[PDB]
């Protein structure tokens, strides 16, 4: 009984009228009752408490006297000092209160029955109390809130508007908001960087087709058996205490894995490709969240003995290690050591084993008579890199007698890119579920890429477009790719443009950070050193120079594939080692840390580093092959690439930037100093088809300036220039304004102006054009200063020199105006107007 359906016919409208919020509520409520939600009238917390008493007493087969119930309420149910996070902890972890009654007996009081999900009572109430809302109670507790909006209303603006007491509502797990035509859900979390519209979600079928309109959503997501599985089994509450509600493709993959295990086991058809299967979830879509989740759920199968969750040590980071520490303590790190693996194996009242592919491979190599070999075993592999994985297969196939193995990847191995390895199909069998890039991009769950070769160094162009790889390896030296001029010019470009690319320009904007991925240890050395030196140079010249905080990490290697780097620092050549040494020292001074380069220190440096790049304590991380495949940083938006990336490694590295965040993060910038255009298209095309590139890759500067049609959608989009010109035709102020309808129009228009500028901020052509608005002239030392920093012709100079932009002041007159009109919310009709909330606040 899958909860993400293969098939669903659309409900028919009544109708039976359906404009008004109270129209939507009437039907929602009616529909929910048909589906077996008892409707109750509740007017007060007091009435809710009593209802909870009735429900929990029923659930738990026990009656409180009033003094106990008061005590239960004050100490567990509804502590005055609990907040949302505490209730979520209670729903997800501490849902049993071991209660001691007046007569001194001890009894487990469950808020939810998780084993017998359908035993839970579900009920609905309406808003008690100017806002229509329906709440679903589970055993009396409010866990879902549906916010209802007029058909007119732009869901996003409504979301923008809303997102103790009365204190029971601290239990909400899930929000749904709907204007009838559209319906999105999102988790109730206090974590503000999970709180933007980007994290709201549509319900869907297993082919990922959306289910948008409320009646269909009701009849699907809101089946008791669906809703309660979502709440209880398909929401994650992790170690940073973030509630994440799984998206449909995540649940669809997960349930399909579990059912596959069960039917295999029942068929006694273990230990072949047809016993398991694979999951093609595109890079960044939550493979690691989902696969881990599915391993945890798999432990609940009584007949499975042990569940291995296996990750690649390459993919580890701080959040992720924190998370595994709870299930397999000090056993999931970068080392070859198995001692910890083999100790977790011998724990009992235990079924989950998390480990790396390196470790599992070592263990099975060494190791011949493990009881686990004869047990009923599940393997879930999260994106394991292709070669470590291959030796592991040989032994696992050799050695486990009864297993069901599954893999998640965003970049499968097909016959075409096989060479070396077994295809993914051949290893795992059937594709159980797919959610591919064009899917994720249509759903706005992954960001597009803006990819440009920074072709601005003629001296070195011929190197930078070289295709033969023998030559490319031959050129990794100071004569060629690490010529100190090349390194300088590139590094200068990066210092000149970091703030522009990461949107730290018109600050106090927070903005983003960045990585620089390079071809070799030496490259990283040259770049680190050059950054250091070039920042000393600014620091004297200027002196309100605000330095970027740069760091680097690497060790030792040794297509498609990003080279695996060891965590055994003693493999490195003496000079590499000493440089890493001096960098760690500098890092130690700055952050008051105390790492070293012995293996334990390096591992800890690695771990602190991930944390600090995630939280932007570091501005630029320089890297050879590390943090390129698994590292999760939503506020990283720019990859600088001086590296020969191809195929799956290309897709992975670029994807470091692809995490959604908010309206401020429009796509990931990829700025390359070798020409990666062919490679980029070949890679995208390998993992889609011939059209896939037009969905993944952003449009040209000229297209955002002058207008185009999104072939995906086909939305015609203006035209920053069209926009700017409309603003001036329509709207030079303040008399331009001042009828309400004109205000509406301005808001819509200046909305687009804001979206367009924000997009354009990521184009060198634009940053260049903007800079030219100073200067002048003379000038004309600072004429020359500017030509040289934006790499601009005389020729080009004269061009740019009027394209015409609106004055800064004229803009801040629009701005505050704009803001003005927003604050006086709360003819003419205002339903469909979205304000650029995120972009403003920036
Ligand atoms: N259902 C969800 N709800 C909220 N946030 C999510 C959800 N799924 C993923 N995310 C967030 O998206 C980001 C990517 O998740 P994750 O790292 O598991 O993706 P991935 O596919 O493993 O990426 P990679 O391919 O780089 O390993 C994380 O910050 C994660 O918390
Ligand atoms: Mg991952």
- Assess whether 250 and 322 both reside in one domain: yes
We report the CATH number of the domain holding residue 814 as 1.20.58.2040
Query: What span, in angstroms and rounded, lies between the C-alpha atoms of 156 and 134?
Result: 19
Q: Tokens 């609990």 map to which residue? A: 82
Nearest to 139 by CA among 165, 113, 115, 116: 113
Continuous segment of H or E residues that includes residue 473:
helix 469-474
Task: Provide the pairing of β-strand 210-211 with 377-382.
Answer: unpaired
Ligand 1 site, residue 288, Cβ cutoff 6 A = yes
Whether residue 655 has its Cβ less than 6 Å from ligand 1: yes
Residue 289 CB less than 6 A away from ligand 1? yes
214/293 Cα distance (integer angstroms): 28
Instruction: Tell me the CA–centroid distance for residue 288 and ligand 1, in Å.
Output: 7
287 in ligand 1 pocket by Cβ < 6 Å? yes
* CATH code where residue 178 lies: 3.90.1570.50
Contact in structure between 731 and 818 (CB atoms under 8 Å)? no
DSSP symbol at 710: -
Q: What's the chain's length in residues?
A: 842
Give the structural domain span for 88. Answer: 44-116
Closest CA to 515 of 504, 505, 527: 527
Regarding the beta carbon of 199 and ligand 1, being less than 6 Å apart is answered: yes
* Chain centre to alpha carbon of residue 181: 26
Q: Hunting for tokens 């198995």 — which residue is that? A: 338
Residue 244 Cβ inside 6 Å of ligand 1? The answer reads yes
The answer to the question of whether 390 is labelled as a binding residue is no
Q: Which residues contact 340 (CB under 8 A, 6 or more apart)?
A: 328, 329, 330, 331, 332
- In three-state secondary structure terms, 407 is strand
Q: Are residues 103 and 121 in the same domain?
A: no
CA separation (Å) from 839 to 606, 687, 759, 770, 805? 34, 33, 11, 18, 20
Q: Is 286 in the pocket of ligand 1 (CB under 6 A)?
A: yes
Co-location of 709 and 811 in the same domain: yes
Q: Ligand 1, from 195, 249, 289, 658: best to mutate by most atoms within 8 Å of Cβ?
A: 289
DSSP codes, 433-452 = EEE-HHHHHHTTSS--EEEE
Residue 187: CB partners within 8 Å, gap ≥ 6? Answer: 173, 174, 175, 194, 199, 235, 243, 244, 245
CA of 286 to the centre of ligand 1 (A): 3
Single residue among 116, 151, 176 that ends a domain in this structure = 116
Q: Are 178 and 140 in contact (CB under 8 A)?
A: no
The single residue listed with the structure tokens 């003419």 is 828
HEC secondary structure over 213-239: CHHHHHCCCCCHHHHHHHHHHCEEECC
C-alpha span between 800 and 791 (Å, rounded): 13
Among all bound ligands, the one having the nearest atom to the CA of 319 is 1
The structure was resolved experimentally with X-ray
Answer yes or no: is 505 a known binding residue.
no
- Is 409 in the same domain as 274? yes
Residue that terminates a domain, selected from 244, 273, 297: 244
3-state secondary structure of 456: coil
Is 401 annotated in a binding site? The answer is: no
Residue 637's SS3 state is: strand
Q: Are 491 and 592 members of one domain?
A: yes
Tokens of 337: 């050591």
Q: How many CB atoms lie within 10 A of CB 386?
A: 18
DSSP strands (E only) in 69-132: 96-100, 106-110, 122-126
For the chain, the helix, strand and coil percentages under 3-state DSSP, each to the nearest 5: 45, 15, 40
643 CA from centroid of ligand 2 (Å): 22
283 is in an annotated binding site: yes
- Select from 764, 840, 836, 841 the least CA-distant residue to 197: 836
How many angstroms does the Cα of residue 303 sit away from the middle of ligand 2? 28
SS3 371: helix
How far away, in angstroms, is 288 Cα from ligand 2 center? 4
SS3 9: coil
CA of 127 to the centre of ligand 1 (A): 34
- Evaluate whether 548 touches 495 at the Cβ level (below 8 Å): yes
- Beta-carbon neighbour count of residue 496 at 10 Å? 12
417 and 313 in one domain? yes
Phi, psi of 662 (to 5 degrees): -160, -170
Domain of 323, CATH number, reads 3.40.50.300
Peptide bond into 166 cis (omega under 30): yes
| Whole-number Å distance between alpha carbons of 792 and 784 | 10
Is the preceding peptide bond at 240 cis, omega within 30 degrees of 0? no
Burial 238-255 (b: 16+ CB within 10 A, else e): beebbbbbbbbbbbbbbb
Residue of 197, 632, 633 to test ligand 1 pocket, by largest number of atoms within 8 Å of CB: 632
- Residue nearest atom 23 of ligand 1, based on CA coordinates: 284
743 is in an annotated binding site: no
With a 6 Å cutoff on the Cβ, whether 372 touches ligand 1 is no
Nearest to 811 by CA among 743, 750, 764, 768: 750
Q: Which residue, among 186, 208, 183, has the nearest Cα to 195 in the 3D structure?
A: 186
Query: Which residues are registered as beta bridge partners of 138?
Result: 122, 141
Token digits of residue 775: 């200067």
Q: Judge contact between 497 and 764, C-beta under 8 A.
A: yes
Q: Are 461 and 478 in contact (CB under 8 A)?
A: no
The sign of the CA dihedral 269, 271, 274, 277 is positive
Do the Cβ atoms of 547 and 586 come closer than 8 Å? Answer: no
- C-alpha of 152 from chain center: 30
CA atoms within 13 A on the CB side of 150: 9
Distance CA 74, CA 811 (A): 55
Please indicate, yes or no, whether residues 210 and 87 belong to a single structural domain of this protein.
no
CA distance linking residue 789 with residue 791, whole number of Å: 5
Upper half-sphere CA count for residue 177 (Cβ side, 13 Å) = 20
Tell whether 347 and 420 lie within a shared domain: yes
CB atoms within 10 A of CB 134: 22
**Residue given tokens 């309400």 in the structure block:** 740
Is-contact 570 600, C-beta < 8 A? no
Q: Which residue has the tokens 């600088």?
A: 640
Looking from the CA of residue 631, the nearest atom of ligand 1 is: 26
Name the CA dihedral angle for 282, 285, 291, 293, rounded to a multiple of 10 degrees: -160
Distance (Å) from CA 317 to ligand 1 centroid: 13
Residue 194 · residue 242 · CB < 8 Å: yes
Cβ–Cβ under 8 Å, residues 273 and 426: yes
Tokens read off for 241: 């205490």
| CA–CA separation, 699 and 706 (whole Å) | 11
Report the 10 Å Cβ neighbour count for 133. 17
Q: Is the CB of 250 under 6 A from ligand 1?
A: yes
Q: Are residues 499 and 526 in the same domain?
A: yes
CB 204 within 8 A of CB 210: yes
Q: Where are the beta strands (DSSP E) in 384-460?
A: 403-409, 431-435, 449-453
Question: Which tokens go with 613?
Answer: 């790049």
Q: Report the C-alpha gap between 516 and 626 in whole angstroms.
A: 11
Mutate to test the pocket of ligand 1, among 284, 384, 444 (most ligand atoms within 8 A of CB): 284
Instruction: Report the distance separating Cα 65 and Cα 74, nearest Å.
Output: 14
Distance CA 294, CA 733 (A): 58
The total number of structural domains that make up the chain: 6
User: How far apart (Å, rounded) are the C-alpha atoms in residues 752 and 724?
Assistant: 10
* Alpha carbon distance 364, 82 (integer Å): 47
Distance CA 774, CA 753 (A): 21
Q: How far apart are CA 287 and CA 308, in angstroms?
A: 16
CA of residue 424 to ligand 2 center, whole Å? 17
DSSP state of 835: P
DSSP per residue, 119-156: GS-EEEEE------EEEEEETTEEEEEEEE--TT--HH
The first and second tokens of residue 465, run together, are 């477009």
Which CATH number does the domain housing residue 112 bear?
A: 3.90.640.50
- H/E stretch holding 708: strand 708-709
**Residue 640, H or E segment:** strand 636-642
CB atoms within 10 A of CB 450: 23
**Whole-number CA gyration radius for the chain:** 29
Q: Does 264 belong to an annotated binding site?
A: no
Nearest CA to ligand 1 atom 9: 286
Q: How far is the CA of 255 from the centre of ligand 2 (A)?
A: 19
In Å, the largest CA–CA distance within the chain is 93
Alpha carbons 321 and 330: distance in angstroms, whole number: 9
Same domain, 544 and 628: yes
Residue 286 marked ligand-binding:
yes
Please check whether residues 454 and 428 belong to one and the same domain: no
Q: Which long-range CB contacts under 8 A does 63-67 form with residues at least 24 apart? A: 64/101, 65/102, 67/102
Look up the CATH number of the domain holding residue 796: 1.10.10.2110
Binding residue per annotation — 575?
no
410 CA closest ligand 1 atom index:
25
What Å distances lie between residue 620 and 200, 491, 539, 594, CA to CA? 30, 12, 18, 21
Instruction: Give the CA angle between residues 434, 436, 440 to the nearest 5°.
Output: 115
Cα of 323 to ligand 2 centre, how many Å? 13
Q: Does the beta carbon of 87 sit less than 6 angstroms from any atom of ligand 1?
A: no
251 alpha carbon, closest ligand: 1
Hey, how many other C-beta atoms are within 10 angstroms of the C-beta on 215? 22
Domain identity same for 645 and 727: no
Residue 230, token pair as written in the block: 């979502």
Please tell me the residue having the least CA distance from ligand 1 atom 2.
246
Ligand 2 centroid, distance to 796 Cα (angstroms) = 44
Neighbour-count burial of 445, counting CB atoms closer than 10 A to its CB (0-12 exposed, 13-18 middle, 19+ buried): buried
Q: Do 173 and 111 form a contact (C-beta atoms < 8 A)?
A: no
Angle in degrees, 0-180, between the axes of helices 357-366 and 388-399, rounded to the nearest 10: 50
Say which ligand is closest to the CA of 174. 1
What whole-number distance in Å separates Cα of residue 339 and Cα of residue 344?
9
Resolution in angstroms for this experimental structure?
2.6
Contact criterion met (CB below 8 Å) for 476 and 520: yes
385 lines ligand 1 (CB under 6 A): no
């Amino acid at each position: 009984n899958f909860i993400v359906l293969d098939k669903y016919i659309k409900a028919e409208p009544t109708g039976d009228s359906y404009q008004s919020e109270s129209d939507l509520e009437r039907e929602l409520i009616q529909d929910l009752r048909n589906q077996g939600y008892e409707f109750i009238s509740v007017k007060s917390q007091s009435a809710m408490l009593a209802n909870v008493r009735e429900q929990l007493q029923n659930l738990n087969g026990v009656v409180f006297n009033d003094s106990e119930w008061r005590r239960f309420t004050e100490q567990y149910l509804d502590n005055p000092s609990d907040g949302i996070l505490d209730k979520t902890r209670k729903i997800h972890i501490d849902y049993i209160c071991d209660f001691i009654f007046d007569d001194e007996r001890l009894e487990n009081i469950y808020l939810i029955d998780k084993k017998n999900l359908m035993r839970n009572k579900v009920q609905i109430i309406q808003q008690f109390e100017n806002r229509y809302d329906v709440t679903i109670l589970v055993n009396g507790l409010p866990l879902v809130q549906i916010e209802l909006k007029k058909r007119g209303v732009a869901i996003r603006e409504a979301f923008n508007q809303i997102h103790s007491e009365n204190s029971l509502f601290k239990y909400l797990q899930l929000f749904v908001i709907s204007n009838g035509t559209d319906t999105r859900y999102f988790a109730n979390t206090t974590k503000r960087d999970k709180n933007s519209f980007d994290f709201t979600m549509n319900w869907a079928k297993s082919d990922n087709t959306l289910i948008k309109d409320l009646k269909d959503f009701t009849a699907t997501c809101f089946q008791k058996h669906t809703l309660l599985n979502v709440l209880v089994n398909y929401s994650v509450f992790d170690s940073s205490q973030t509630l994440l509600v799984m998206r449909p493709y995540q649940i669809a993959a997960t349930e399909r894995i579990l059912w596959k295990i069960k039917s295999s086991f029942t068929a006694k058809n273990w230990s072949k490709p047809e016993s398991g299967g694979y999951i093609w979830h595109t890079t960044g879509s939550g493979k690691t969240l989902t696969s881990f989740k599915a391993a945890r759920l798999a432990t609940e199968l009584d007949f499975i003995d042990k569940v291995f969750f296996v990750v690649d040590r390459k993919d580890l980071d701080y959040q992720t290690m924190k998370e595994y520490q709870r299930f397999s303590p000090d056993s999931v790190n970068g080392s070859e050591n198995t001692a910890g693996l083999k100790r977790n194996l011998d724990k009992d009242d235990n079924k989950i084993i998390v480990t790396t592919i390196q470790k599992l491979n070592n263990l099975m190599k060494a190791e011949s008579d493990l009881p686990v070999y004869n047990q009923q075993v599940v393997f879930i592999f999260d994106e394991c890199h292709r070669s470590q994985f291959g030796e592991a297969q040989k032994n696992l196939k050799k050695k486990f007698k009864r297993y069901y193995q599954f893999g998640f990847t965003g970049t499968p191995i097909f016959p075409e890119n096989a060479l070396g390895s077994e295809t993914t199909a051949s290893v795992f069998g059937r594709e159980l579920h797919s959610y591919v890039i064009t899917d994720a991009i249509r759903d706005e769950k992954v960001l597009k890429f803006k990819v440009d070769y920074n072709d601005v160094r003629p001296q070195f162009k011929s190197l930078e477009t070289e295709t033969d790889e023998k030559k490319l390896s031959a050129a990794e030296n100071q004569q060629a790719f690490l010529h100190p001029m090349r390194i300088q010019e590139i590094t200068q470009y990066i210092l000149n443009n970091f703030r522009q690319k990461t949107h730290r320009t018109f600050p106090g904007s927070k903005g983003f950070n960045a990585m620089l991925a390079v071809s070799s240890v030496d490259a990283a050395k040259a770049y680190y050193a050059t950054f250091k030196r070039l920042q000393e140079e600014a620091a004297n010249k200027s002196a309100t120079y605000k330095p970027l905080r740069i760091a680097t990490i690497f060790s030792f290697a040794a297509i498609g594939e990003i080279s695996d780097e060891t965590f055994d620092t003693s493999a490195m050549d003496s000079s590499a080692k000493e440089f890493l040494d001096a960098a760690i020292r500098e890092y130690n001074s700055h952050f008051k840390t105390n790492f070293s380069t012995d293996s334990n220190g390096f591992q800890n440096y690695y771990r602190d580093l991930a944390q600090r790049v995630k939280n932007q304590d570091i501005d630029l991380l320089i890297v050879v092959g590390m943090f390129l495949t698994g590292f999760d940083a939503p506020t990283l938006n720019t990859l600088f690439v001086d590296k020969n990336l191809r195929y799956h490694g290309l897709m992975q590295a670029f994807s470091r930037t692809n995490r959604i965040y908010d309206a401020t993060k429009t796509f990931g910038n990829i700025v390359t100093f070798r020409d990666l255009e062919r490679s980029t298209i070949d890679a995208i095309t390998l993992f889609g088809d011939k059209n896939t590139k037009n969905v993944v890759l952003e449009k040209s500067y000229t297209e955002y300036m002058e207008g185009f049609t999104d072939a995906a959608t086909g939305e015609a989009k203006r035209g920053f220039m069209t926009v700017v010109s409309e603003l001036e035709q329509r709207f030079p102020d303040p008399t331009s304004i001042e009828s309400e309808k004109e205000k509406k129009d301005f808001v819509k228009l200046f909305g687009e102006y804001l979206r367009a500028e924000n997009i354009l901020q990521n184009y060198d052509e634009f940053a260049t054009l903007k800079a030219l608005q100073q200067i002048d002239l003379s000038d004309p030392v600072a004429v020359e200063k500017f030509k040289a920093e934006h790499y601009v012709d005389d020729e080009k100079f004269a061009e740019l020199q009027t394209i015409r932009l609106p004055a800064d002041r004229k803009i801040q007159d629009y701005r505050s105006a704009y803001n003005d009109i927003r604050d006086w919310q709360r003819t003419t009709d205002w339903d469909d107007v979205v304000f650029e909330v995120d972009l403003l606040k920036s």
